[PDB]
Symmetry: C4
Subunit: 164 residues, 4 copies
């Protein structure tokens, strides 16, 4: 499929089902899926970097990005298209060489500009229709992994090669 040099991803509604847990004390949680770490694995296996673009800003996400050895983390991003363009500048690539997955309004402008756009099955219809590949999985169900595997054309042969 289309050649990709950078994989970018939103968090809420992609790495999660959109859930934001609040308690009585000011603490907050997100629920990640260990399945998604394999998306980082396949990307790094093919020598492709992964960056997170999120509108939120939390220690939750910083620690998760650390655990998964994500290459870039941008939090509190107000303009994701600008952020992506700037990062493309740094790497000497075009948006045409980027695969991005997001699920909501703040992702729309960037989704429309990238080489491959992914949107989970759980997303609003007017975002889902921006997706250029079909994703079966919902947010939090391992849809980041699904996206990476499809974008990179990971097949049974690739699997067999890594489990020797």
């Amino acid at each position: 499929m289309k050649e990709i040099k950078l994989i970018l991803t939103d968090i809420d509604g992609v790495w999660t089902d959109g859930g934001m847990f609040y308690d009585q004390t000011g603490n907050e949680w997100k629920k990640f899926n260990t399945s998604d770490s394999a998306g980082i694995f396949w990307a790094h296996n093919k020598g492709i970097p992964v960056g997170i673009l999120t509108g939120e800003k939390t220690e939750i996400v910083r620690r998760r990005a650390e655990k998964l050895k994500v290459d870039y983390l941008f939090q509190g991003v107000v303009d994701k298209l600008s952020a992506a363009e700037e990062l493309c500048n740094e790497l000497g690539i075009n948006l045409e060489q980027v695969a991005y997955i997001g699920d909501d309004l703040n992702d729309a402008k960037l989704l429309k500009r990238v080489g491959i756009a992914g949107v989970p099955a759980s997303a609003p219809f007017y975002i889902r229709r921006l997706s250029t590949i079909f994703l079966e999985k919902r947010g939090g169900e391992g849809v980041f992994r699904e996206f990476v595997e499809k974008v990179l054309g990971i097949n049974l042969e690739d699997f067999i090669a890594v489990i020797q």
Copy 2:
């Protein structure tokens, strides 16, 4: 769609799937869905205030309401119809100009009196039948967003206009 001047909403079973998480220490959680924040976005985009009426009283909900810039928050409400009527008086509107979404016994009197009544798909059947519009989504699945988008007639053109 009927003219609407105020959107009101329950929390438990609408903004959540009814889940109430308890630990061993007296703390408590709810799980919100980031998708519902777009309900506030659309309402405010159309100049319409949003109010929360809940029979619970928690810091959980105080914090979530603040995060989403909800216009009105009423907690520990014992009589939601009276509460809605009083707010209408203060605003110079009548219940026929209100859209309300709720899911259970304490919402029924108000559901029967508003201009547009919404009830999530997850709700008890005797409450569900009070709904005057069909909602596909369950509590916690983004059903508040679904309600707002339906009530305000948010369409593709409206979406295209905001992502420019």
Copy 3:
């Protein structure tokens, strides 16, 4: 529906989906569903007490029981049939006048001896086949409410009566 004078219930797998959340510090959580409180409402409306029999013993459940004004709470119960017999003996009640809902091995002896036995849709097949009424809901989905409404014959007329 036959005459019922006491409604008894398990917690894990009935009031919850079986979920037991553990953290890194020795704390523990359960997720309840606010829908189930209506089960207590209907029982009390009909003048029927509710008791909890659970094999676990937690502050989680003590607090939840208090919040819902449950009439009886017995925790750390090893022999649920004996516990039920002893409670009923204090109240003058025959097991045939009891409705009990449970979901697992420790509930089977009691389920086989009560007037109405309920088992959630999510339960192991060997237990589900002991249910004497059909319950559509899974643990944590409001199946306690479902059980009470069916056992007490709660219909649209009862609903109309409480909201008028």
Copy 4:
């Protein structure tokens, strides 16, 4: 079913749906399903030890292993096949007498070598195809219980015998 002398299991994605909950303070949760404890019950009832092999290392799992009286607990395992072979050598059994359930890349080598391999319905397709028995349940839904019951041929007669 074939002769089994040891049951081994992964945690994340088998005993859970893969969920990893992070808060703002460095704490972490997993959500277990009480249903899975019956897996240990049946195994011990047939005189068969159970061991956990997991690549994570948490107090969460120490606590859950203790609660369920699991015979062996190995965490931070990087090579599950080697760990299993070493354990087998110690017990004087071979891999053909082991039943193992896992869901992801780190489980594949061992799944290919055991006497009975189980993989939950929620797992990646290239792992699921390694399963030698059909499992209907997803991670966190009681799939460890399902695996044990199938591996040990637990039938209605067994159930009847234990509830007398």
